[PDB]
């Protein structure tokens, strides 16, 4: 119901991450520390084939209160990797903090990043099954404060329009490729069976998280926290919408 930062006032009595309902109290959750020493290389892991990631079109951007989610529509499927059949992009949200020290979702060798971006792909057809492997989300790390990339520029421009929670706007025009690292860098990643980073966790996600973070200007990162708020009144910002790390358990993380 609520992040740990939100449950800091005497009022606004909601359930923090330590008391999240549903199936979020189990072994596999999602946010784990990825030690590169203990991971084993899987030869079958190959870079994904990004079809429809080069098209430019308007995207719906809205203040989901807990984060900013961008609807990816159709025609942005993924067929590469070791995914069962193929997955189609449906949503794009991200998590950040007030500085590149607190962290964002996943950590590599105990190292966190300024911002974490979650591109979630739903299973294309499958069937009416309750089985796992229903979502194949791509995780990208973001931590840099030097140079501005035009890929994230329309997103930052659209950020002020959704300042209040439950507000809707639209990105002017951009492509998914521009917001991703160069294809020459998208070669190494990790796969682990996590459930969900949001409450009512369901163990149906592949969680292919990439190394080699993306670089955005520090001004854009500051605007992310400055232009967003949790409550209806512009009092509490959206700094720390990050779930605390969870035990790895007996799950084994593979490396490409």
């Amino acid at each position: 119901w609520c992040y740990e930062i939100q449950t800091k006032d005497p009022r606004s009595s909601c359930l923090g991450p330590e008391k999240w309902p549903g199936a979020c109290k189990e072994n596999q959750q999602s946010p784990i520390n990825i030690v590169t020493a203990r991971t084993k290389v899987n030869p079958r892991l190959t870079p994904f084939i990004l079809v429809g990631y080069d098209q430019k079109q308007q995207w719906p951007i809205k203040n989901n209160q807990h984060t900013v989610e961008m609807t990816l529509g159709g025609g942005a499927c993924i067929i590469g990797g070791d995914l069962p059949a193929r997955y189609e992009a449906v949503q794009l949200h991200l998590h950040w903090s007030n500085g590149n020290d607190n962290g964002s979702e996943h950590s590599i060798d105990g190292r966190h990043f300024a911002m974490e971006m979650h591109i979630v792909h739903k299973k294309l057809t499958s069937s009416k099954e309750d089985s796992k492997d229903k979502f194949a989300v791509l995780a990208f790390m973001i931590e840099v404060g030097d140079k501005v990339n035009k890929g994230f520029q329309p997103l930052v421009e659209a950020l002020p329009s959704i300042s209040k929670p439950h507000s809707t706007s639209t990105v002017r025009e951009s492509s998914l490729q521009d917001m991703l690292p160069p294809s020459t860098k998208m070669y190494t990643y990790f796969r682990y069976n996590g459930s969900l980073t949001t409450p009512n966790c369901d163990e149906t996600v592949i969680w292919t998280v990439y190394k080699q973070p993306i670089k955005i200007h520090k001004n854009q990162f500051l605007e992310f926290s400055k232009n967003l708020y949790y409550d209806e009144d512009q009092k509490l910002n959206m700094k720390d919408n990050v779930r605390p790390l969870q035990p790895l358990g007996k799950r084994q993380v593979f490396k490409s």
Partner: peptide, 21 residues
């Protein structure tokens, strides 16, 4: 239309806004 608008009614995902082309 290019998709099926939806809420987080199933999994918290699937929260898709109506998209058109």
């Amino acid at each position: 239309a290019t998709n099926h608008q939806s809420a987080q009614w199933p999994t918290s995902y699937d929260a898709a806004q109506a998209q058109t082309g």
